[PDB]
Amino acid sequence: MVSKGEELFTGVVPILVELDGDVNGHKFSVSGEGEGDATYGKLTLKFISTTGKLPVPWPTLVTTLVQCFARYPDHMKQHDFFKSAMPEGYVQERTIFFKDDGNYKTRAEVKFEGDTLVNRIELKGIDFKEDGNILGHKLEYNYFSGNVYITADKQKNGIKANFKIRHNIEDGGVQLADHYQQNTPIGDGPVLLPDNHYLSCQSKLSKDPNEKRDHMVLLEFVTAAGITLGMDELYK
């Protein structure tokens, strides 16, 4: 059946994101506006630095700056926890370990305000090297992909997830970021607790040529995968 959460994502939903961040004492704020189309798992957003200059590279904030917009194939629709928690929303907590560097700890509330999907985030980064790849702004600004591996967590009535992101470095190397993640529903109603699966994500980063503030234009595609259910036998 069309469960109640999925009904809110059949069309284009406007998106607001607000992030307060503190990395090694540098405080910043990011405001993002855009839209999501879960039918195609498509995100189009523009983020602006409102406090001033970012102490960290924009690509390291991508994974933090709304997985309820993932496209779950029909045969996987019973494993979409994120939509099933709507409109009351969910709390998403993450720890991002940057290899041989500091770590982010993020707490976000994702919920509907009227017809708008809203993501309010607080981020705290610690133990970062001053001349490292993050604070030294040594990372490339282009594109990256990710496979978010999701398992259920019925004790907290939510989900857990892990993944690895490999950010290209300007010299040619790789900055590794290990994400560990937990999501818990905000309401007390029933939610879909999924079998193991993953989200294939692709993120393209660009710049508005007319924008003079520190900003990031992001185009994202997120598709659930990892469950066949026997869709191969249908065609002999």
User: Which value in Å is the resolution of this experimental model?
Assistant: 2.3
Q: What are phi and psi of 81, to 5 degrees?
A: -70, -35
Structural domain total, the chain: 1
What CATH number does residue 148 fall under?
A: 2.40.155.10
Task: Count CB-CB contacts under 10 A for residue 140.
Answer: 16
How far apart, in whole angstroms, are the C-alpha atoms of residue 61 and residue 177?
Answer: 11
Is residue 4, in this structure, part of any structural domain at all? no
Does residue 234 sit within a domain? no
DSSP string, 192-220: PPPPSEEEEEEEEEE--TT--SSEEEEEE
Residue 1 lies in a domain: no
* Residue that is written with structure tokens 């798992």 in the block: 41
Structure tokens at 189: 């109603």
Distance CA 46, CA 206 (A): 10
Locate 121 and state its tokens: 């985030």
| Structural domain boundaries, residue 157 | 12-227
Helix (H) or strand (E) run with residue 84 in it:
helix 81-84
Domain assignment present for 191 = yes
